[PDB]
Design a protein around this ligand. Structure first.
Ligand SMILES: O=C1c2c(O)cc(O)cc2O[C@@H](c2ccc(O)c(O)c2)[C@@H]1O
Ligand SMILES: O=c1c(O)c(-c2ccc(O)c(O)c2)oc2cc(O)cc(O)c12
Ligand SMILES: [Fe+2]
Length: 349
């Protein structure tokens, strides 16, 4: 087999993109210039949710924060979090380290190559075509488990820059504390005991944080490709940092909305795992990512996942009734991923 990286392809001297990267005719109509889209301020916009008072001693103010978070989660399921408690300089260090790793030559990065055939899903990679369509997306990435610390395989983590492990480790620990805060507020929002949702997704012991650095090289025909296809996240929550190059779009009320770049914020997505547990109340929104011909875009997504086999995910009893039937059948996290991949494979077949 050939190992083709999109960064290599982007630098190979091509004029047009290979056919495998061109989206189906029906999808091309919704793809426009990301910079022109980012400038548009009409239509619904991704909400900015202020978490400053999420754990305030002042009850009215705390409840107001919880309600705003709850409301954004039932409606959009995605938002720009501000005053989230993660130090701004730590986030800049994490991004700088990721930028430095991706600036290494493809050859240096191949020393970290993943190997799906032997189950080595961590490391440097690019999505291999996995259905009859043969469709590929315009991005390379680096994926690794980031937390808990005892479950990490540090040997696969970038050794250049020298501070990648230190920075990424601190960031994951900070995000783990923020996930607890969020899970609690979302639990309260559904009328559940504060510790309910985090317990249901594994708690401190089994919830995993996976880091995925998404690298989107410049594209010569950005109107014909997607950096990441339309999808919903399978996690419980996802927290993402960006390098201020636009690209994230959200499918809201039947239209693709472009996310604006809100300084110092962290994008947070409610994922399929919480949507399933809340019986459809909290929303896992369909989203995608655009590429462009002017600037390399990079994002850092941390997925908070339940244990893949140990928990059977299904709507919580409290969220189901005669009048509110279960909107999802029971599946473990692995089974859910397989079902989404299976439905797509059958679709393309
Ligand atoms: O490779 C993948 C993957 C993985 O390797 C490890 C992991 O822990 C979770 C994962 O999740 C997969 C997935 C599938 C369909 C989706 O809609 C989605 O959001 C995520 C993904 O393809
Ligand atoms: O959206 C997701 C995604 O893209 C990937 C991923 C991981 C490894 C790969 O090799 C890859 O091609 C993709 O993992 C995820 C894990 C989650 O818990 C939730 C997600 O939403 C994703
Ligand atoms: Fe996503």
């Amino acid at each position: 087999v050939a190992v083709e990286r999109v960064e290599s392809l982007a630098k190979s001297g091509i004029i047009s993109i290979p056919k495998e990267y061109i989206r189906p005719k029906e999808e091309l109509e919704s793809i426009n210039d990301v910079f022109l889209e980012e400038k548009k301020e009409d239509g619904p916009q991704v909400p900015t949710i202020d978490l400053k008072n999420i754990e305030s001693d002042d009850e009215k103010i705390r409840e107001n924060c919880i309600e705003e978070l709850k409301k954004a989660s039932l409606d959009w399921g995605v938002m720009h979090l501000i005053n989230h408690g993660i130090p701004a300089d730590l986030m800049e260090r994490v991004k700088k380290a990721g930028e430095e790793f991706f600036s290494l030559s493809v050859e240096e990065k191949e020393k970290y190559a993943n190997d799906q055939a032997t189950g080595k899903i961590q490391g440097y990679g690019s999505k291999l075509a996995n259905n009859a369509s043969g469709q590929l997306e315009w991005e390379d990435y680096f994926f690794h488990l980031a937390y808990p610390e005892e479950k990490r395989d540090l040997s696969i983590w970038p050794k250049t820059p020298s501070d990648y492990i230190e920075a990424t480790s601190e960031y994951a620990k900070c995000l783990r504390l923020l996930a607890t805060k969020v899970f609690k507020a979302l639990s309260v929002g559904l009328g559940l005991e504060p510790d309910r949702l985090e317990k249901e997704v594994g708690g401190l012991e089994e919830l995993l944080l996976q880091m995925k650095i998404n690298y989107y090289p410049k594209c010569p025909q950005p109107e014909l490709a997607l950096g990441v296809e339309a999808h919903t996240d399978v996690s419980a929550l996802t927290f993402i940092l960006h390098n201020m190059v636009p690209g994230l779009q959200l499918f809201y009320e039947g239209k693709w909305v472009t996310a604006k770049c809100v300084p110092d914020s962290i994008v947070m997505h409610i994922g399929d795992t919480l949507e399933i547990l809340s019986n459809g109340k909290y929303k896992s929104i369909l989203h995608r990512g655009l590429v462009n011909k002017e600037k390399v875009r990079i994002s850092w997504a941390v997925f908070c996942e339940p244990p893949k086999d140990k928990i059977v995910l299904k709507p919580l009893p409290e969220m189901v009734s005669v009048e509110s039937p279960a909107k999802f059948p029971p599946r473990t996290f692995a089974q859910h991923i397989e079902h989404k991949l299976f439905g797509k494979e059958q679709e393309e077949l």
